[PDB]
Amino acid sequence: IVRPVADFSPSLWGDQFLSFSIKNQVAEKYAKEIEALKEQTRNMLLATGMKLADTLNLIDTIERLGISYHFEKEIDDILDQIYNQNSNCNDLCTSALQFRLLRQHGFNISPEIFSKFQDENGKFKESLASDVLGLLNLYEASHVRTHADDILEDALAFSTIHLESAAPHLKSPLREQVTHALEQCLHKGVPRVETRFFISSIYDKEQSKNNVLLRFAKLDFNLLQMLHKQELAQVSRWWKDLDFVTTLPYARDRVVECYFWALGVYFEPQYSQARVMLVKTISMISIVDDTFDAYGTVKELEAYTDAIQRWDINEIDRLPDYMKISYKAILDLYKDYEKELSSAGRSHIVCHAIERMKEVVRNYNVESTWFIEGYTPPVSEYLSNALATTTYYYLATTSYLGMKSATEQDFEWLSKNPKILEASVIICRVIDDTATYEVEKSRGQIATGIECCMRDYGISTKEAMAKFQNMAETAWKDINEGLLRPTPVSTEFLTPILNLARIVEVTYIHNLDGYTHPEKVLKPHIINLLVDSIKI
Ligand SMILES: C/C(=C\COP(=O)(O)OP(=O)(O)O)CC/C=C(\C)CNc1ccccc1
Ligand SMILES: [Mg+2]
Ligand SMILES: [Mg+2]
Numbered sequence: 001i002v003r004p005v006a007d008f009s010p011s012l013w014g015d016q017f018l019s020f021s022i023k024n025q026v027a028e029k030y031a032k033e034i035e036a037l038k039e040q041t042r043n044m045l046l047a048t049g050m051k052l053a054d055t056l057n058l059i060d061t062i063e064r065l066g067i068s069y070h071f072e073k074e075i076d077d078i079l080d081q082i083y084n085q086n087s088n089c090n091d092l093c094t095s096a097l098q099f100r101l102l103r104q105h106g107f108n109i110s111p112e113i114f115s116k117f118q119d120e121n122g123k124f125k126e127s128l129a130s131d132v133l134g135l136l137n138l139y140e141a142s143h144v145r146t147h148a149d150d151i152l153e154d155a156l157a158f159s160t161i162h163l164e165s166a167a168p169h170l171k172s173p174l175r176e177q178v179t180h181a182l183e184q185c186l187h188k189g190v191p192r193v194e195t196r197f198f199i200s201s202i203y204d205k206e207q208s209k210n211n212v213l214l215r216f217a218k219l220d221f222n223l224l225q226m227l228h229k230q231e232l233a234q235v236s237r238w239w240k241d242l243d244f245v246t247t248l249p250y251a252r253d254r255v256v257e258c259y260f261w262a263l264g265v266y267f268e269p270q271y272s273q274a275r276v277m278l279v280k281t282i283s284m285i286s287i288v289d290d291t292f293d294a295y296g297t298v299k300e301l302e303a304y305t306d307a308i309q310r311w312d313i314n315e316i317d318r319l320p321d322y323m324k325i326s327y328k329a330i331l332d333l334y335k336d337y338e339k340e341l342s343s344a345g346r347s348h349i350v351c352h353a354i355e356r357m358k359e360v361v362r363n364y365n366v367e368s369t370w371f372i373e374g375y376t377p378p379v380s381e382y383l384s385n386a387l388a389t390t391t392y393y394y395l396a397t398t399s400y401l402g403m404k405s406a407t408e409q410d411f412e413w414l415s416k417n418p419k420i421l422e423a424s425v426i427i428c429r430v431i432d433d434t435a436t437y438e439v440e441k442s443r444g445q446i447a448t449g450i451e452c453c454m455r456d457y458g459i460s461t462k463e464a465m466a467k468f469q470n471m472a473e474t475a476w477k478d479i480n481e482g483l484l485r486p487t488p489v490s491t492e493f494l495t496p497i498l499n500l501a502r503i504v505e506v507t508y509i510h511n512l513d514g515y516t517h518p519e520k521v522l523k524p525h526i527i528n529l530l531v532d533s534i535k536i
C-alpha cells in the first residue's frame with residue numbers, strides 16, 4: 001500500500017511558543033494601572049450631556065481599541081437609549097456610525113436614516129463625494145446590511161470609489177485608516193487583528209488621541225497577550241506530547257494557526273478554558289481531515305468512519321496502526337473534556353460535540369467515496385454533504401463547551417442548525433472552494449465544489465466562483481440579521497458563530513489557503529498577536 005507524497009509546509013514556528021513564563025511582576029503592575037484607567041474610562045462613558053456624535057465616537061473608539069468588553073453594560077445602556085430616541089437630524093458620518101453601532105449590537109435601527117443622503121432613486125447624493133469621514137463611516141456601515149436593507153445597495157460601491165479617489169492626498173493617519181478599511185472592513189475582520197492595527201498604526205498616531213484610552217488599550221492588549229501566550233505554551237506542550245509531527249507526518253502541522261483560530265472566536269480572559277478546549281479539537285479534526293484527504297485508502301477510511309460512529313476503544317484493533325494513533329487520541333481528548341468539566345457538573349454536554357464530530361467524519365467518508373468513484377454530484381447534493389465537512393457545525397458546538405454559562409437549551413438551539421450557524425458554515429464552504437479550486441484541480445480531484453457548480457449550471461469557472469461569492473453575500477446578510485433582537489439565544493452564544501465567519505474571510509483574503517500556507521497571511525497576524533508586544 002503506497003501512498004501520496006507528503007507535500008505540506010512544516011510549522012514555521014518550531015518550539016518558540018513551547019515555554020512561556022509569565023512575569024508576575026510585570027503583570028501585576030499592568031493590572032494595577034488598568035484598574036485605575038478602567039474607571040477613568042467608565043466615567044468618560046457615563047459623562048452627562050454629551051453630543052450624539054461625541055458619544056458614538058467615544059464608543060466606536062473604545063470598541064476599536066479592544067477594551068469595550070470591559071463596558072458591555074454601559075455601552076449597551078447608551079446605545080439602547082440612542083435607539084429608543086430616533087434621532088434623524090445628523091450628517092452622513094454620524095448617521096452611518098449610529099447605524100453601524102446599533103446594528104452590531106442587535107438594535108434593528110431603520111435604514112431609512114439614509115434616505116436624506118439619497119436622490120429619488122436610492123442612489124447616494126454625489127455631492128457627498130468630498131466628505132471623507134462620512135464616506136469612511138458609510139463604507140463600514142455598508143457591511144452590516146441584512147436582506148431588508150436594500151436601501152444601502154449603492155453604499156459600498158459609492159463609498160469605495162470615492163475613498164479610493166481621495167486616499168492618496170489624505171493626511172496621516174487618516175490615509176492609512178482608509179487604505180486599510182478598503183482592504184479589510186471592520187465588521188468582517190478578526191477583532192484582535194483589527195485592534196492591534198488600530199492601537200498601533202492609527203490611534204497611537206492621531207493628533208487628537210485621548211491619552212488615557214491609548215494607554216489603557218496598550219496595557220490591556222499586552223496583558224491579555226500574556227494570557228494568550230500561556231495558553232499557547234500549554235497547548236504547544238500538549239501537541240508535542242502527541243508528536244503527530246513524526247508519527248503522522250502526512251498531516252499538516254498547524255497547532256499555532258489553530259490557536260490563532262480559537263483566539264479569533266474569543267479573546268477575553270473569561271473564555272480561557274474554552275479557547276484551550278476549542279483549539280485542541282480544531283487541531284485534532286485537522287488531522288482527521290488530512291487522513292481522508294491525503295493518505296488513507298478507501299478501505300482504510302471505512303474502518304475509520306465506522307469506528308468513529310461506534311465510539312469505543314475496542315475498535316482500535318480493526319484499524320491500521322497509524323489510525324490507532326489518531327483514534328485513541330480522539331477518544332482520549334473527549335474523556336479529558338468530560339473530566340475538565342467534571343467539577344462544574346457540565347460533563348454531559350460533551351456528547352453534543354461528539355455527535356457533531358461523528359457527523360463530520362461521516363461526510364469525510366462520503367466525500368472520499370465520490371472522489372474514488374469520480375462522482376460529480378449536483379450542487380444541491382454536493383452542499384448537503386460538503387457543509388458539514390467545513391467542520392463548522394462542529395467547531396461552533398465545541399466553542400460552547402468551555403463557556404461556563406452555556407445551558408442545554410443553548411446546545412438544543414445549536415443542534416437545530418439555526419440560520420445564523422448555517423450562514424457562517426456556508427461562508428466557510430464557498431470561500432474554501434474558491435481558494436482551493438486550482439489547488440486541487442491539479443491534485444486530481446474531479447469532485448471539487450466549483451467543479452459541481454460548472455457541470456450543473458452549464459457555467460464557466462468565472463460564473464461558478466461568482467455564484468459562490470454570491471451565496472457568501474447572502475450568508476452575511478443572514479448573519480447580520482441573526483444578531484438582531486430578540487435573539488434566539490443570548491448574544492454571548494452568537495458572537496462565536498459570527499467570529500467563525502470572520503476568521504474564514506481573514507485567512508482566505510485575496511483568495512489563498514492561509515491555513516495551509518500561513519506564510520503570506522497568517523504569520524504576520526500571529527506575530528502581531530502572540531509574538532510582538534505593543535511598544536509603549
Ligand atoms: C483546514 C481544514 C479544512 C480546509 O482544508 P481543505 O481545503 O483541504 O478542506 P476540504 O477537504 O475542502 O474540506 C479543517 C481543519 C481546521 C479547522 C477545523 C479550522 N480552519 C478551517 C479552514 C477552512 C475550512 C475549514 C476549517
Ligand atoms: Mg477533506
Ligand atoms: Mg483538506
Ligand SMILES: [Mg+2]
Pocket residue numbers: 432433436437
Ligand atoms: Mg476545498
